[PDB]
């Protein structure tokens, strides 16, 4: 299937190999395609990016601020401006299936796509650094 | 000194031992005590432990409901009802250093130096899964 291709390609990369691959596909399932969706695991995927973000900048500088953090982490979470740009480097637009009434390349589906692959991978390796690390050098 | 011994007795009781324990003392230094306070790795313990209850949902139920999971996160993070009781079941009221006069309350107080622990511990750590380890003790030893 060209769904099965497009996937492997996606694996490397972001540079992380799936153990099952179910998690993936779901993953990039939006939830206007089936009721078997990533509503879920894009939510996980959300507090994933905070923590990343929140672990890089506290271990840089200690003394921050908690309104310059709070920022930083907005800013790093803004749909349009940083989580659809990210999803839209990797071409999620191509892969994300969606219903023939919705456009792929909405930055909402993107961002969604997004997110949802770092709740994908946390759960597929049994640790959440790991999510971490794949979010940098991708973002 | 009293301060430093509640310290020693709280990373005991909480299973981890601090490499830079002034990232502990760090975490139990309210805002009105000083500026060296621990409101931005409240923010960090915070999105730490929503991490931690949606790895341990969606290990056992994968189609669990999107408005399922924001409920669970919503009641494990509550402010009055459940990162305070964790709080104050370690004893955090008498080793958070306060001052007199003090706008938050005793639970909110109590869950900003419960969150900011774990912030510290992956601070130390390196690792975020060392502080998601911890904190399913702390909390699974109550609830």
């Known amino acids: 299937s060209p769904f099965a291709t497009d996937l492997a390609k996606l694996q490397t990369q972001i540079g992380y190999k799936?153990?099952?691959?179910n998690l993936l596909r779901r993953a990039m399932t939006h939830a206007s395609f089936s009721q078997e969706n990533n509503k879920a695991l894009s939510i996980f995927g959300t507090h994933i990016i905070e923590t990343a973000v929140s672990l890089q900048f506290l271990a840089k500088d200690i003394d921050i601020s908690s309104k310059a953090l709070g920022r930083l982490i907005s800013e790093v979470s803004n749909v349009?401006?940083?989580?659809?740009?990210?999803?839209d480097r990797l071409g999620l637009g191509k892969i994300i299936r969606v219903s023939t009434k919705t456009d792929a390349s909405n930055s909402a589906i993107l961002c969604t796509g997004?997110?949802?692959?770092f709740g994908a991978i946390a759960i597929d390796a049994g640790t959440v650094d790991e999510a971490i690390k794949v979010f940098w050098k991708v973002h």
């Not at 799936?18 to 691959?21: A, E, L, M, S, V």
């Open 18 to 21: 799936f153990n099952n691959i």
């Open 114 to 117: 997004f997110r949802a692959i």
């Open 80 to 87: 349009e401006s940083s989580c659809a740009l990210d999803g």
